[PDB]
Design a binder for this molecule. Structure first.
Ligand code: GSH
Ligand code: GSH
Ligand code: D26
Ligand code: MG
Lengths: 198, 198
């Protein structure tokens, strides 16, 4: 199966798929486009948003739909039907918050105001909810790593760019991040991937 | 299993779960709360949001995570893993859009103005995408009804309250709503359910 992932030159919403490709050792074309080439691609897509994943001539969309598709029947999926539910839920919780950021806002002052509020007022509560939920367990769901741990690590990396002290009071969450960063396939990708802010 | 669904007295984010229960002929307690019973219940929830589903005492959260879990191994989920990806993709596309609405906005003029903006510009764009995606086919994905069709009927029902003429130029999408409403288990539910604006 030939895989071609199209997104911007960013970790962004494509990073979860990139970590999954890496973990399962699947070769794919990591297509990164410049904004100048975006509108011309956007015009041809069923839903006009990226990332998109082409699989054998069939254009998939929605980052998490794609991530879920790639991890189905792999060890990154939950180990029970109920675990796959918790995986899905943690991912959508992380996603709901990340989606609140006005990533495309062109008015810089309005963008900064918004970012600062979400990070200062809302992010600390999400960390508290996740920390309690994790408890003293090794992974967010079950006894082995799932793509929710991957998504936690990814989301938290971006939040830390803007608010570095976010996890000063959550050592257990720092440990989880580090655990994810230590997985050989993930570590390799982290070392070799393009270094972008977002 | 002993299922208990908790949400406000409204269709909202719990309705997709309610359609799934009805369609799969799965018994559950449809527990609805008033504001007054919210602060106590909220305090007991790992993520402080509804809906939640309790399955034999185990608590689940995130509406789409729950819906997907309930459809597991059923034809409603999508027939192949690829179709399941398309089903998931449509669902998030719809949810992404519905999440744009300031449901909680307390300034009535601001709420009206934002709704108008979203219903005037964004909604018709998304409707053109959904319509061409469906084409002259029977259902959104595959050969049979999926919970994406359910979610479409649910999201549009709520949008039609605010912009009744939204689908006036989209007969294929109106036909989809009707095909879904006529499914016997759904027709029954729609008649039995408590009447609420949202
Ligand atoms: N929930 C969607 C969001 C997709 C999305 O809005 N992507 C952005 C980039 S992060 C985009 O397509 N922006 C360009 C545009 O809207 O034209 C997903 O996870 O794929
Ligand atoms: N993406 C989540 C959203 C859950 C959510 O925002 N629930 C709302 C009710 S519609 C809520 O609990 N808001 C009131 C509050 O958080 O106090 C889902 O679909 O379950
Ligand atoms: C989870 C994790 C990361 C993200 C994003 N990061 C940068 C984004 C962006 C910047 C300009 N456009 N889009 S979006 C979203 C959800
Ligand atoms: Mg979502």
């Amino acid at each position: 199966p030939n895989y071609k992932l199209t997104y911007f030159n960013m970790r962004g919403r494509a990073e979860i798929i990139r970590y999954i490709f890496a973990y399962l050792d699947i070769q794919y074309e990591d297509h990164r486009i410049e904004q100048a080439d975006w509108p011309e691609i956007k015009s041809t897509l069923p839903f006009g948003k990226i990332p998109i994943l082409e699989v054998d001539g069939l254009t998939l969309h929605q980052s998490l739909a794609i991530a879920r598709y790639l991890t189905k029947n792999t060890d990154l999926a939950g180990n029970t039907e109920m675990e796959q539910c918790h995986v899905d839920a943690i991912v959508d919780t992380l996603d709901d918050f990340m989606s609140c950021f006005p990533w495309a806002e062109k008015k810089q002052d309005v963008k900064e105001q918004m970012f600062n509020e979400l990070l200062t007022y809302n992010a600390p509560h999400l960390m508290q909810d996740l920390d309690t939920y994790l408890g003293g367990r090794e992974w967010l769901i079950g006894n082995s790593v799932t793509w929710a741990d991957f998504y936690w690590e990814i989301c938290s990396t971006t939040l830390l760019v803007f608010k570095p002290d976010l996890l000063d009071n959550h050592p257990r969450l720092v440990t989880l991040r580090k655990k994810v960063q230590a997985i050989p396939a993930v570590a390799n990708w982290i070392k070799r991937r393009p270094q972008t802010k977002l």
